[PDB]
Ligand binder design. Structure first.
Ligand SMILES: O=S(=O)(O)CCN1CCCN(CCS(=O)(=O)O)CC1
Ligand SMILES: O=S(=O)(O)CCN1CCCN(CCS(=O)(=O)O)CC1
Ligand SMILES: Cc1ncc(COP(=O)(O)O)c(CN)c1O
Ligand SMILES: Cc1ncc(COP(=O)(O)O)c(CN)c1O
Ligand SMILES: [Cl-]
Ligand SMILES: [Cl-]
Ligand SMILES: [Mg+2]
Ligand SMILES: [Mg+2]
Lengths: 373, 373
């Protein structure tokens, strides 16, 4: 069976976890610290904090900006539910904006238009666009728009560690940026994430919030404010540190497999049967998602791929369709693209241990399903 | 150097983590499921959920009971800050009650008296007593009091997995009970925790909240409500599963070391120089904390123990002294015991790899410091 994801943990990391478990510095230590330094260096960004998961990064980003009851944040319609959920868990309201059919990312024009017509009652405080599947496209526009309207930008870069927006690493443009190390992502620590920022107060506040408001004072550990526990373990950090220096190379290989998909599938796209993703420069290809034409039933397609030894899945959800984010501004809007991607979007296997023969088999099987051969 | 804590990870668990990392079922799986079943069986309780840490268990317990803005929860003055912090992170207010000089646990009489004189404005919804250091004493009284006043009981059993209140396992008396698997605790998963309950709706709600409101529906995974990510990894769960069948035995050995401390130190207690903890039946001895007399400076004692090759620390904090929990009801109360334990309480090494000679060395060194020999 060709699998969607096969997490790759280097043997050196496995040995290192063993050493840690046996010695027994388990809690956040020199491994987390070093992982943060290496993440910061990788990204070109002043600060990193590793945390329990990608949702925690988002959560701390909201909390550090003091976003909560009375406030509003704009989220894309197409994403994993965490993006909108985590906004509402603070008390704020998730205001949904549709995404663009080509990028699968928040539509910058709908975004600006949503801001201009905003009528409260809550105060709009941030934009939380998703760089979906590792796609950076739109990011500079989101920044430009956020500044024009005096809003914070929080990058939900869950899927985009290693993606690059022209000259600038994804995650480093927002006031803060957030990454997931969930096993479906390309660097995984099983569960894990990171919150990054160029802002010292946001960093220091998130860091207090991450660990019970603890910081170092003259006579020892001080408790300066209320907080949570969103710490990552030292052995998880070690896992991540071993993957990070391989990550760019892994991404390069993924872009090469995407080239293979694109050329093999281009005729099906020509015939109007599928829409292929635009893998722009700096796309990290965390996911390769096509869109099935209208005529097809994704459930049947997936079944027939599975019978041919190929895994597939939906790409992401439609937040409007979940019916959980019920600000009047959402119920009075109309969403077109996100709901379509939710039903017709089909992720195909693309990871570190697929080769050209695997992709040829996948595309031939797709062909035979769609064209009936 | 004799150490306060030396986390014990069995070699079988280490190998199992390796297998998991290499195979790569990383996210919550059959290991978490099984760990929950074994925890439930160990405790005699209907439901367990493993979670990222002990603070997360507490958090989910609050959220599952719908505790937040407008609400109040009673917490002990002597505990780790998470207990009070996590109440306030929901929007509720932490109402502090002093603890008892012998048990280090919430004073049941001050508790009841705090309820009787409560004057809002918030609605009092719960009691969150701490079974501090693994001490069960008071637990049935907390239940009795909670029922009399129609309040939920949430056990902060962070430190008390394996402790027993007469016939009944700690954690199984509250509407919910919460455990930490932090490395200072006797079973550790590096970071980890569990939320347990005999109530099906609280279990089902916490479980939705733990993972983005996900549950199983006829055509697949459904998103039924907003939630968080508080999942534990499959490999962490494996660690915990390997420790749990050893835990009772580990506790028995700890009670035996406590016997040794008690007899070696009893003269110092006789002379009024220290107060020894009362290790009642069912105390899991997560921590052995003495209280220094007035005359002594704990900082100097700790320094001199360290120079004699012995680690020590404070036991816990005073919530009133942190000045973070500022409901009028707290600022107009007076706390006696918690503030004293905060300054005079001294934890001494007691874990799986200390022997009688280690304890004899510790108590002789203490003796020579206090009596100046
Ligand atoms: O697609 S296959 O599974 O048939 C072969 C994939 N190869 C296996 C060898 C590791 N890696 C080299 C990169 S690194 O050493 O991990 O940085 C390239 C990916
Ligand atoms: O105190 S010492 O470090 O000198 C010796 C401690 N022993 C080491 C042997 C493991 N265990 C047996 C219990 S179990 O097999 O882990 O369940 C008892 C604790
Ligand atoms: C866009 C997006 N945002 C947020 C998250 C949440 O990250 P985590 O799973 O690490 O909690 C995910 C997880 N797949 C995601 O894809
Ligand atoms: C009484 C108490 N409550 C809550 C916690 C929080 O648990 P965790 O460290 O697993 O987040 C601790 C941690 N030592 C604790 O001792
Ligand atoms: Cl190849
Ligand atoms: Cl011995
Ligand atoms: Mg060991
Ligand atoms: Mg492997």
């Amino acid at each position: 069976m060709i699998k969607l994801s096969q997490p790759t943990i280097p043997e050196a990391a496995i040995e290192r976890v063993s050493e840690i478990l046996r010695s027994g510095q388990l809690v956040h230590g020199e491994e987390c610290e070093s992982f943060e330094q290496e993440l910061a260096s990788f990204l070109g960004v002043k600060h990193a904090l590793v945390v329990s998961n990608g949702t925690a990064a988002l959560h701390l980003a909201l909390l550090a900006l003091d976003i909560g009851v009375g406030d509003a944040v704009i989220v894309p319609d197409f994403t994993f539910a965490a993006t909108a959920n985590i906004v509402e868990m603070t008390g704020a309201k998730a205001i949904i904006v549709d995404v663009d059919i080509e990028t699968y990312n928040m539509d910058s024009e709908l975004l600006e238009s949503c801001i201009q017509s905003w009528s409260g009652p809550e105060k709009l405080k941030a934009i939380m666009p998703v760089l979906e599947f590792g796609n950076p496209h739109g990011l500079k526009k989101y920044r430009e728009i956020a500044n024009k309207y005096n809003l914070a930008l929080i990058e939900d870069a869950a899927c985009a560690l290693g993606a690059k927006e022209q000259d600038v690493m994804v995650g480093t443009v927002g006031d803060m940026g957030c990454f997931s190390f969930h096993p479906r992502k390309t660097l995984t620590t099983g569960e894990g994430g990171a919150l990054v920022t160029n802002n010292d107060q946001l960093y220091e506040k998130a860091k207090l919030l991450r660990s019970h408001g603890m910081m170092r004072g003259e006579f020892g550990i001080e408790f300066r404010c209320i907080g949570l526990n969103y710490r990552l373990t030292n052995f998880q950090a070690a896992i991540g540190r071993a993957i990070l220096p391989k990550l760019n190379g892994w991404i390069e290989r993924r872009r090469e497999l995407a080239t293979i998909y694109e050329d093999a599938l281009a005729p099906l796209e020509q015939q109007g049967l599928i829409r292929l993703p635009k893998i722009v420069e700096g796309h990290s290809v965390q996911t390769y998602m096509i869109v099935l034409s209208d005529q097809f039933n994704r459930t049947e397609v997936m079944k027939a791929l599975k019978e041919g030894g190929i895994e597939s899945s939906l790409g992401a959800q439609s937040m409007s369709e979940l019916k959980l984010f019920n600000h009047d501004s959402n119920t009075k809007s109309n969403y077109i693209i996100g709901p379509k991607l939710y039903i017709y979007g089909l992720a195909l296997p693309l990871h570190e241990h697929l080769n050209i023969d695997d992709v040829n088999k996948i595309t031939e099987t797709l062909e035979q399903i769609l064209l009936k051969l």
